[PDB]
Design a protein around this motif. Structure first.
Motif, mmCIF file in Angstrom:
data_model
loop_
_atom_site.group_PDB
_atom_site.id
_atom_site.type_symbol
_atom_site.label_atom_id
_atom_site.label_comp_id
_atom_site.label_asym_id
_atom_site.label_seq_id
_atom_site.Cartn_x
_atom_site.Cartn_y
_atom_site.Cartn_z
ATOM 1 N N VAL A 1 0.853 -1.185 0.000
ATOM 2 C CA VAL A 1 0.000 0.000 0.000
ATOM 3 C C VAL A 1 0.907 1.260 0.000
ATOM 4 N N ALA A 2 1.733 1.380 1.026
ATOM 5 C CA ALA A 2 2.708 2.473 1.089
ATOM 6 C C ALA A 2 2.017 3.846 1.039
ATOM 7 N N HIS A 3 2.514 4.741 0.165
ATOM 8 C CA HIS A 3 2.115 6.135 0.205
ATOM 9 C C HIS A 3 1.531 6.589 -1.129
ATOM 10 N N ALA A 4 0.952 7.785 -1.102
ATOM 11 C CA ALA A 4 0.267 8.350 -2.266
ATOM 12 C C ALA A 4 1.224 9.174 -3.111
ATOM 13 N N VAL A 5 2.377 9.524 -2.542
ATOM 14 C CA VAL A 5 3.424 10.258 -3.214
ATOM 15 C C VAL A 5 4.765 9.620 -2.887
ATOM 16 N N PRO A 6 5.793 9.897 -3.722
ATOM 17 C CA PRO A 6 7.108 9.299 -3.508
ATOM 18 C C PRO A 6 7.823 9.657 -2.183
ATOM 19 N N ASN A 7 7.635 10.875 -1.704
ATOM 20 C CA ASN A 7 8.410 11.315 -0.530
ATOM 21 C C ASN A 7 7.502 12.090 0.424
ATOM 22 N N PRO A 8 6.604 11.358 1.108
ATOM 23 C CA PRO A 8 5.663 12.024 1.997
ATOM 24 C C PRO A 8 6.387 12.668 3.187
ATOM 25 N N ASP A 9 5.813 13.744 3.724
ATOM 26 C CA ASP A 9 6.312 14.251 4.992
ATOM 27 C C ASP A 9 6.118 13.180 6.091
ATOM 28 N N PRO A 10 6.942 13.193 7.178
ATOM 29 C CA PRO A 10 6.894 12.153 8.160
ATOM 30 C C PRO A 10 5.553 12.024 8.929
ATOM 31 N N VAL A 11 4.803 13.106 9.032
ATOM 32 C CA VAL A 11 3.491 13.019 9.711
ATOM 33 C C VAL A 11 2.486 12.336 8.811
ATOM 34 N N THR A 12 2.407 12.738 7.537
ATOM 35 C CA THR A 12 1.603 11.990 6.557
ATOM 36 C C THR A 12 2.056 10.570 6.547
ATOM 37 N N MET A 13 3.365 10.314 6.596
ATOM 38 C CA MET A 13 3.883 8.949 6.597
ATOM 39 C C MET A 13 3.230 8.147 7.738
ATOM 40 N N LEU A 14 3.246 8.702 8.949
ATOM 41 C CA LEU A 14 2.686 8.031 10.125
ATOM 42 C C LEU A 14 1.165 7.804 9.946
ATOM 43 N N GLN A 15 0.466 8.812 9.404
ATOM 44 C CA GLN A 15 -0.998 8.651 9.178
ATOM 45 C C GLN A 15 -1.221 7.530 8.166
ATOM 46 N N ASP A 16 -0.436 7.511 7.096
ATOM 47 C CA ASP A 16 -0.557 6.416 6.103
ATOM 48 C C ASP A 16 -0.353 5.067 6.765
ATOM 49 N N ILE A 17 0.702 4.956 7.555
ATOM 50 C CA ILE A 17 1.062 3.733 8.222
ATOM 51 C C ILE A 17 -0.079 3.248 9.110
ATOM 52 N N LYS A 18 -0.833 4.151 9.729
ATOM 53 C CA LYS A 18 -1.999 3.743 10.513
ATOM 54 C C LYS A 18 -3.112 3.143 9.637
ATOM 55 N N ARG A 19 -3.180 3.580 8.402
ATOM 56 C CA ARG A 19 -4.288 3.224 7.518
ATOM 57 C C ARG A 19 -4.015 2.036 6.605
ATOM 58 N N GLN A 20 -2.766 1.706 6.352
ATOM 59 C CA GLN A 20 -2.457 0.688 5.377
ATOM 60 C C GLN A 20 -3.001 -0.696 5.771
ATOM 61 N N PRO A 21 -2.858 -1.141 7.027
ATOM 62 C CA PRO A 21 -3.248 -2.539 7.285
ATOM 63 C C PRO A 21 -4.684 -2.832 6.987
ATOM 64 N N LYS A 22 -5.619 -1.920 7.266
ATOM 65 C CA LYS A 22 -7.018 -2.176 6.977
ATOM 66 C C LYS A 22 -7.224 -2.455 5.482
ATOM 67 N N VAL A 23 -6.491 -1.764 4.629
ATOM 68 C CA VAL A 23 -6.588 -2.029 3.185
ATOM 69 C C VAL A 23 -6.276 -3.499 2.879
ATOM 70 N N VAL A 24 -5.179 -4.000 3.437
ATOM 71 C CA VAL A 24 -4.750 -5.386 3.191
ATOM 72 C C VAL A 24 -5.736 -6.349 3.810
ATOM 73 N N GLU A 25 -6.226 -6.071 5.015
ATOM 74 C CA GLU A 25 -7.231 -6.963 5.602
ATOM 75 C C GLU A 25 -8.450 -7.072 4.698
ATOM 76 N N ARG A 26 -8.914 -5.935 4.167
ATOM 77 C CA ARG A 26 -10.115 -5.993 3.314
ATOM 78 C C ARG A 26 -9.798 -6.782 2.038
ATOM 79 N N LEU A 27 -8.646 -6.544 1.405
ATOM 80 C CA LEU A 27 -8.245 -7.313 0.237
ATOM 81 C C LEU A 27 -8.202 -8.812 0.524
ATOM 82 N N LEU A 28 -7.649 -9.198 1.674
ATOM 83 C CA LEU A 28 -7.558 -10.617 2.009
ATOM 84 C C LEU A 28 -8.926 -11.229 2.262
ATOM 85 N N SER A 29 -9.921 -10.400 2.580
ATOM 86 C CA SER A 29 -11.284 -10.899 2.872
ATOM 87 C C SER A 29 -12.063 -11.187 1.617
#
Length: 201
Positions: A160-188
């Protein structure tokens, strides 16, 4: 990374899946599903680097059947995907995948996920589909001590990673909070859904 885009690693023929990905999943299916901690234990770094050199510098298929460290093969697979020039799910669709996964009702969330998968480039979709069929099996195996959330935790950064190549570190952390749910839904999503992209039905 100098890996460049997923499409440089596939041919014109469907399903469009890189050799490295097929070969890594083969070994894990052949002798990994009885091992605990798949995709969460790191392989020996030197071993992972040596295998990477064979596939990406020498342009050969190393003899993965001889690699005793199954976790180095899990690590090699993750490394290859993580170091693609854009993530498997694409920069374009990163937010669409997160937002689809974050819809609170399962049924509407699932509908939105199918829409997002359907918008992927073909190589990305085919590779994703193959990977999901595999990872479902890792979660189903009672010996791995891995569930879908355990896999989603580490595949979130990987695919999943990020929406841009070099996100700021706060966006990075917000992305990181959101990525696993994407994979869980895909696996379902059903086996029969992912399987359709491997063949002509």
């Amino acid at each position: 990374s100098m890996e460049g885009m997923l499409a440089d690693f596939v041919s014109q023929t469907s399903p469009m899946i890189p050799s490295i990905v097929v070969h890594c999943v083969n070994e894990i299916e052949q002798r990994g599903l009885t091992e605990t901690g798949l995709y969460r234990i790191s392989g020996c770094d030197r071993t992972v680097k040596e295998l990477k050199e064979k596939f990406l510098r020498v342009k050969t298929v190393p003899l993965l059947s001889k690699v005793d460290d199954i976790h180095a093969i899990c690590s090699l697979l993750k490394d290859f995907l993580r170091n693609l020039k854009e993530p498997l799910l694409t920069f374009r669709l990163n937010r669409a995948f997160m937002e689809a996964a974050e819809i609170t009702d399962e049924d509407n969330s699932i509908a939105a996920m199918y829409q997002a998968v359907g918008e992927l480039p073909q190589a990305n979709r085919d590779t994703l589909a193959f990977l999901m069929i595999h990872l479902q099996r890792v979660a189903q195996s009672p010996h791995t001590k891995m569930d879908v959330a355990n896999l989603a935790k580490v595949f979130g950064p990987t695919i999943v990673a990020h929406a841009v190549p070099n996100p700021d570190p706060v966006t990075m952390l917000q992305d990181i909070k959101r990525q696993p749910k994407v994979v869980e839904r895909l696996l379902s999503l059903p086996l029969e859904y992912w399987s359709q992209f491997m063949m002509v039905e």
